[PDB]
A paper describes a structure:
Light-oxygen-voltage (LOV) proteins form a sensory photoreceptor class that elicit a wide palette of physiological responses to blue light across archaea, bacteria, protists, fungi, and plants. Likely via a radical-pair mechanism, T1 reacts within microseconds to the signaling state, characterized by a covalent thioadduct between a highly conserved cysteine residue in the LOV photosensor and the C4a atom of the flavin isoalloxazine ring system. Thioadduct formation entails a hybridization change of the flavin C4a atom from sp2 to sp3 and concomitant protonation of the adjacent N5 atom. A highly conserved glutamine residue in strand Iβ is situated immediately adjacent to the flavin and has been identified as instrumental in reading out the flavin N5 position and eliciting the downstream transitions.
To arrive at a molecular understanding, we solved the crystal structures of AsLOV2 wild-type and Q513L in the dark-adapted states to resolutions of 1.00 Å and 0.90 Å, respectively. In dark-adapted AsLOV2 Q513L, the flavin plane was displaced by ~0.4 Å relative to the wild-type protein, arguably due to steric interactions between the flavin O4 and the Cδ2 methyl group of L513. Notably, no ordered water molecules entered the space vacated by the glutamine removal. The resultant loss of hydrogen bonds at the flavin O4 atom may account for the hypsochromic absorbance shift evidenced above across the different LOV receptors with replaced glutamine. The Q513L replacement notwithstanding, the crucial N414 residue assumed the conformation seen in darkness for the wild type, i.e., engaged in hydrogen bonds with D515 and the backbone carbonyl O of residue 513. Interestingly, the Q513L dark state showed alternate conformations for the Aβ-Bβ and Gβ-Hβ loops, in the case of the wild-type receptor only seen upon light exposure. We note that neither the dark-adapted nor the light-adapted structures of AsLOV2 Q513L revealed direct evidence for ordered water molecules near the flavin N5 atom.
Numbering used by the authors: 401 to 546
The structure:
């Protein structure tokens, strides 16, 4: 297949990296785990905005929260239902944050997905947010010199 994984894309988390300096903030890196979760090949999602994950049951109020975080160049953590290539639904405890360069400018966005079978609360929410925020901090490290 085209676009074999880089070293970074074999990290064992579901994540993407987008480039907001390109039109429509497209995916430029996507982990192996993300591509199995979502059942796409890497080549058919590179260069596309992540909105292909959305479908009829995806709450548009929650999508707007992501949109507004991107516009304000800030982080957000939300839960929403997303869809795979084959149409299967999954809950996504999702964390976005910008990655800044050495001048503080936003260079990339990082998105980390914790897939589940239900909306989580309380301890499962806390532990999931702990994991996706630690993961985002790790990808900030991993992506800084790309
Ligand atoms: C790094 C990154 C990852 C994203 N991951 C998801 C995701 O997992 N699920 C989702 O529904 N939208 C995701 N999005 C949000 C969409 O790409 C898009 O920003 C959102 O649909 C709002 O913009 P729109 O109104 O133009 O579609 C992600 C965006 C970025 C920048
Ligand atoms: Mg696109
Ligand atoms: Mg926010």
């Amino acid at each position: 297949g085209e676009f074999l994984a880089t070293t970074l894309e074999r990290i064992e988390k579901n994540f993407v990296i987008t480039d907001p300096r390109l039109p429509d903030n497209p995916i430029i890196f996507a982990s192996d785990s993300f591509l199995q979760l979502t059942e796409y090949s890497r080549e058919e999602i590179l260069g596309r905005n992540c909105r292909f994950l959305q479908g009829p049951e995806t709450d548009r109020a929650t999508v707007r929260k992501i949109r507004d975080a991107i516009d304000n160049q800030t982080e957000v953590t939300v839960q929403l239902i997303n869809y795979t290539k084959s149409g299967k639904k999954f809950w996504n405890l999702f964390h976005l944050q910008p990655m800044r360069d050495q001048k503080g400018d936003v260079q990339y966005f990082i998105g980390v997905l914790l897939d589940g079978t239900e909306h989580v609360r309380d301890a499962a929410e806390r532990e999931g947010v702990m994991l996706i925020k630690k993961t985002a901090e790790n990808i900030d490290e991993a992506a800084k010199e790309l």
